[PDB]
Amino acid sequence: ETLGEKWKARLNQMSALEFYSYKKSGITEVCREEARRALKDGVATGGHAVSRGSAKLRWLVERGYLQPYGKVIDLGCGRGGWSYYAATIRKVQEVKGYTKGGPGHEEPVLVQSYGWNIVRLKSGVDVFHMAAEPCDTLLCDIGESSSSPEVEEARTLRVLSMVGDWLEKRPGAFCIKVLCPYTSTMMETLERLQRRYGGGLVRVPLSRNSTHEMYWVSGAKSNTIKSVSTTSQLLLGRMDGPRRPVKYEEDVNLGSGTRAVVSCAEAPNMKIIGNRIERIRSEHAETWFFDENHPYRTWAYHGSYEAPTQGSASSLINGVVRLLSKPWDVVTGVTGIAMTDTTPYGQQRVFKEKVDTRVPDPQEGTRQVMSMVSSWLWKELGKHKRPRVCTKEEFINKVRSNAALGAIFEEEKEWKTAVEAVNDPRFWALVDKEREHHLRGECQSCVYNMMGKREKKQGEFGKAKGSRAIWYMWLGARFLEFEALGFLNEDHWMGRENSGGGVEGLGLQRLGYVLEEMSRIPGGRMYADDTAGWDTRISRFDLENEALITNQMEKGHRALALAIIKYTYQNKVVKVLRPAEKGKTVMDIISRQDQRGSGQVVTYALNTFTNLVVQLIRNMEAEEVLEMQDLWLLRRSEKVTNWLQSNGWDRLKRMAVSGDDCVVKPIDDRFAHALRFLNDMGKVRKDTQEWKPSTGWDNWEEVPFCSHHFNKLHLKDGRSIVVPCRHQDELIGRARVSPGAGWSIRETACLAKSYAQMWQLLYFHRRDLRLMANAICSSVPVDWVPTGRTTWSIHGKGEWMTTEDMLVVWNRVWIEENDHMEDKTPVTKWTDIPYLGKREDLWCGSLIGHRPRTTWAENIKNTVNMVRRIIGDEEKYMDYLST
């Protein structure tokens, strides 16, 4: 029929050697060796093109067929070379990149090409089911080649059927891949759409002679049949006669580093922080400089200096656990788990999106409601207990050796560990200086340090997951914090006794009893919806509400505490690690006046507090106390305190919140759609439409809280206990990981023990965790001491970190100290303790009944004896496996 069709049939008639001769003949290419080495190495700061695509778009823009700007959207990014080139162009502002990825060779790559700070990529996106969005520039490289023109047509048509929905929303420019433009159905539709929306079709010489792929672009106006049949003609004429020589061109150099952006941050009160700033400058005045290409939007850029790189991403294996769990080598849910990327890159590529936000300033009515509820809560909390200053001796009483130092200034760089510094009165002399300055109204040293947290998390793109930001101040400042507001934690102000809704310090054993007590309480359903990135969502007004406690202190206590709040919380100065161009790395200093840090002493206290305030507010809105106008301004504010004193405790005891996480039990289902105040404050719901009603639950056993759902188990003798559970795969993955670089096998086995006894203590009800844990404790010498860190939760006291035997500890925590258990009868043997229900065990991630688990379980003894051999013989093992 058409020129393209006959050319295609002829191409398929060919054999392998003619295929070879033709496919490359006389096209243009780029020297890809320079890049393809850096890809194998992973040299991010090389600034090379991750795919060929970058050269394609480059040729498209240099000739002038595409004029991109503003909000750019890449469809089918793949590695992402399109997006990465997009970043470079003068007029672009935001680059989002979407592709399918996953199984098969089809994933993305993360590098440090110029302007990477505006490149937000994502995987696992069937864009056909994705609703469109209003771009300024639309890009699409989608279209799988094939032999059958039926396919090329079918697909390319489907692609267009998708992209139409987007294009109708008016992009300033566009480029779309068209695999088959040479068929009659194709030619017709392409002419119709060229008329209806514009642009024109251009064939690129970079593309190989083995496909008819053409690109539909904004800046052109050529007729379909013209360029299409010109391309077909050139392809045919290239087929016959001479194999013409490939032409070599230089691949584009993207550069490296960050790009400048619109600084929308509030101006800092230089009187407060200027001392710290100019002190830091005066200390690092040798290499101090100001980069114009700061990547910060919502923080005040205060400067940078040259520094060395900290942390890494590499993830090591605990061969103990892995060799004791070969059947789990298949599950992605465990293998994909790895370390967090704590490099400056891995930090900043989370910072720029999660942390670089400025919360919507809530309205004056919501402000008034917040301050009222916060005042009432400070009243009802400080009734029984009163504030007090904490003493040095309490600080050194609580302190341990492992705590973080925080080397900032030259005067602070003497000591090595905490236990050393605390015993040197020079330390306390500097503390007395910063205290005298604080009382005088100046701050010289309370500066925040920040880096990426060493966590065990699900890997993304088959690669290291990014590290969330953690920031804390140096020891002395933490002491000032402790003596000022140290007590709220110490006296257990958030304890269920005093608070009612809080659960400060209570372990994972108990919390399910709180959920049972809450379920016996009548009403509607249970709602536990996670608040997205709580730390960033804390606003000025919330901090001013939390500072209201100062009215219950005394003159000195109020002076020190309020001073610390003002010069520490309400104005924050941070030191952060950023990777610079050409491989070097630098330290930036920034500031802001909002949100909260993970390393603030009263993190849990303030978080739990303001979270309770939020839940109270939403309970008022749900029960028709707050009308829709009262966001703008409050009507008849007294009917707030009328409700608070009528049912406050009555509703507060219907709460179980812990820092960021929350559990609520309201009177009726209106709580599911009382989102207006919640949203106005800026406390959005994670992974849910902002305006869609919340998911509730009937059966309390299924409630997720602090990552765990709590199940009730009856003992074989008759008594009932409440146990925490979650998905097996996450725990097995966590055990697999080894945190340190270059650790001797001893300490890794120590970690394996720690995890084993953790599972025995808590997740005994899980057949695979009990089995595997007994296998670890068996294969590990019972001599050795458990070391390391297993979970970062505060509700794990660390009861498994001892040489004791776990039956006795189990009896202590689950029977002897169990407040909700009346009969104190200890249990004699392991097999009296029941497992979880077989169906529920299967659901929570168990592999019982499958043949790899049966094989591994029946040959457990051979493998464990192999572990004993590998460690080393003539060491004392105990054979825990009796059954």
Binding-site residue positions for Zn(2+): 434, 438, 443, 446, 709, 725, 844
Q: Decide: 663 and 612 in contact? Cβ < 8 Å.
A: no
Taking the complex as a whole, how short is the minimal distance between the CB of residue 249 and Zn ion, in angstroms? 58
C-alpha pair distances (Å), 305 with each of 281, 285, 294, 601: 9, 8, 13, 29
Which residue's structure tokens are 């240099």? 62
Taking the complex as a whole, how short is the minimal distance between the CB of residue 413 and Zn ion, in angstroms? 18
Taking the complex as a whole, how short is the minimal distance between the CB of residue 567 and Zn ion, in angstroms? 6
Annotated binding-site positions for S-adenosyl-L-methionine:
51, 81-82, 99-100, 126-127, 215
Q: How many CB atoms sit inside 10 A of residue 681's CB? A: 28
Q: Residue 742 or residue 849: which is nearer to Zn ion going by CB?
A: 849
Segment lying near Zn ion (by CB under 5 A), choices 318-326, 387-395, 437-445, 631-639: 437-445
With CA atoms as reference, report the closest residue to 811 among 761, 866, 737, 882. 761
Q: How many CB atoms sit inside 10 A of residue 16's CB? A: 7
What is the rounded distance in angstroms from the CA atom of residue 368 to the CA atom of residue 375?
A: 10
Taking the complex as a whole, how short is the minimal distance between the CB of residue 727 and Zn ion, in angstroms? 8
Segment lying near Zn ion (by CB under 5 A), choices 343-351, 435-443, 552-560, 800-808: 435-443
> Which residues partner with 861 through β-bridges?
none
- Show the tokens assigned to 750: 């120590």
Q: Decide: 529 and 695 in contact? Cβ < 8 Å.
A: yes
Q: Decide: 444 and 276 in contact? Cβ < 8 Å.
A: yes
Taking the complex as a whole, how short is the minimal distance between the CB of residue 710 and Zn ion, in angstroms? 8
Dihedrals phi, psi of 816, to nearest 5 degrees: -65, -40
Strands across the sheet containing 214-217: 119-122, 92-98, 70-75, 137-140, 173-178, 214-217, 200-202
Annotated binding-site positions:
51, 81-82, 99-100, 126-127, 215, 434, 438, 443, 446, 709, 725, 844
Taking the complex as a whole, how short is the minimal distance between the CB of residue 785 and Zn ion, in angstroms? 31
C-alpha pair distances (Å), 218 with each of 75, 90, 270: 16, 18, 48
Q: Residue 726 or residue 812: which is nearer to Zn ion going by CB?
A: 726
Taking the complex as a whole, how short is the minimal distance between the CB of residue 709 and Zn ion, in angstroms? 6
What is the rounded distance in angstroms from the CA atom of residue 511 to the CA atom of residue 493?
A: 18
Three-class DSSP labels, 626-681? CCHHHHCCCCCCHHHHHHHHHHHHHHHCCECCECCECCECCCCHHHHHCCHHHHHH
Q: Residue 227 or residue 707: which is nearer to Zn ion going by CB?
A: 707
Segment lying near Zn ion (by CB under 5 A), choices 209-217, 424-432, 488-496, 719-727: 719-727
Among residue numbers 745 through 784, which ones bind Zn ion (CB under 5 A)? none
Q: Residue 277 or residue 446: which is nearer to Zn ion going by CB?
A: 446
- Ramachandran area for residue 241 (φ above 0: left; ψ -120 to 50: alpha; else beta): left
Taking the complex as a whole, how short is the minimal distance between the CB of residue 448 and Zn ion, in angstroms? 11
Q: Residue 446 or residue 589: which is nearer to Zn ion going by CB?
A: 446
Segment lying near Zn ion (by CB under 5 A), choices 231-239, 440-448, 589-597, 631-639: 440-448
Output the furthest CA–CA distance in the chain (Å, rounded). 97
What is the rounded distance in angstroms from the CA atom of residue 258 to the CA atom of residue 581?
A: 8
Taking the complex as a whole, how short is the minimal distance between the CB of residue 389 and Zn ion, in angstroms? 17
Size of the site for Zn ion (CB under 5 A): 4
**728-736 vs 745-762: helix axis angle to the nearest 10?**
160
446 part of the interface to Zn ion, by CB under 5 A: yes
Q: Residue 24 or residue 279: which is nearer to Zn ion going by CB?
A: 279
User: Which amino acid type is present at position 433?
Assistant: K
Q: Decide: 867 and 320 in contact? Cβ < 8 Å.
A: yes
- Ramachandran area for residue 803 (φ above 0: left; ψ -120 to 50: alpha; else beta): alpha
60 part of the interface to Zn ion, by CB under 5 A: no
Q: Residue 634 or residue 769: which is nearer to Zn ion going by CB?
A: 769
Among residue numbers 829 through 848, which ones bind Zn ion (CB under 5 A)? 844
Show the site string, 793-832: x = touches Zn ion by CB under 5 A, - = not. ----------------------------------------
What is the rounded distance in angstroms from the CA atom of residue 91 to the CA atom of residue 777?
A: 61
What is the rounded distance in angstroms from the CA atom of residue 757 to the CA atom of residue 773?
A: 7
Taking the complex as a whole, how short is the minimal distance between the CB of residue 462 and Zn ion, in angstroms? 28
* Residues recorded for the chain: 883
β-strands 119-122, 70-75: how paired? unpaired
Q: How far is CA 818 from the centre of its chain?
A: 36
Q: Residue 254 or residue 443: which is nearer to Zn ion going by CB?
A: 443
Taking the complex as a whole, how short is the minimal distance between the CB of residue 443 and Zn ion, in angstroms? 3
Q: Residue 309 or residue 519: which is nearer to Zn ion going by CB?
A: 519
DSSP state of 266: P
443 part of the interface to Zn ion, by CB under 5 A: yes
C-alpha pair distances (Å), 660 with each of 77, 97, 707: 35, 30, 12
Taking the complex as a whole, how short is the minimal distance between the CB of residue 725 and Zn ion, in angstroms? 3
With CA atoms as reference, report the closest residue to 559 among 436, 716, 681. 436
Q: Residue 464 or residue 574: which is nearer to Zn ion going by CB?
A: 574
Q: Residue 307 or residue 713: which is nearer to Zn ion going by CB?
A: 713
725 part of the interface to Zn ion, by CB under 5 A: yes
561 part of the interface to Zn ion, by CB under 5 A: no
What SS3 class is residue 796? Answer: coil
Residue 825 burial (C-beta neighbours within 10 Å; 0-12, 13-18, 19+): exposed
Q: With the C-alpha atoms ordered 373, 376, 380, 386, is the resulting torsion angle positive or negative?
A: positive
Segment lying near Zn ion (by CB under 5 A), choices 187-195, 411-419, 445-453, 817-825: 445-453
What is the rounded distance in angstroms from the CA atom of residue 398 to the CA atom of residue 421?
A: 14
Q: Residue 443 or residue 771: which is nearer to Zn ion going by CB?
A: 443
Q: Residue 173 or residue 477: which is nearer to Zn ion going by CB?
A: 477
Taking the complex as a whole, how short is the minimal distance between the CB of residue 446 and Zn ion, in angstroms? 3
Taking the complex as a whole, how short is the minimal distance between the CB of residue 476 and Zn ion, in angstroms? 9
Taking the complex as a whole, how short is the minimal distance between the CB of residue 723 and Zn ion, in angstroms? 9
Which residue's structure tokens are 């994670």? 686
Q: Residue 127 or residue 515: which is nearer to Zn ion going by CB?
A: 515
Show the site string, 844-883: x = touches Zn ion by CB under 5 A, - = not. x---------------------------------------
Show the site string, 17-36: x = touches Zn ion by CB under 5 A, - = not. --------------------
Q: Residue 252 or residue 446: which is nearer to Zn ion going by CB?
A: 446
Segment lying near Zn ion (by CB under 5 A), choices 158-166, 232-240, 618-626, 721-729: 721-729
What SS3 class is residue 38? Answer: helix
With CA atoms as reference, report the closest residue to 363 among 577, 620, 541. 541
Point out which residues bind Zn ion (CB under 5 A). Answer: 443, 446, 725, 844
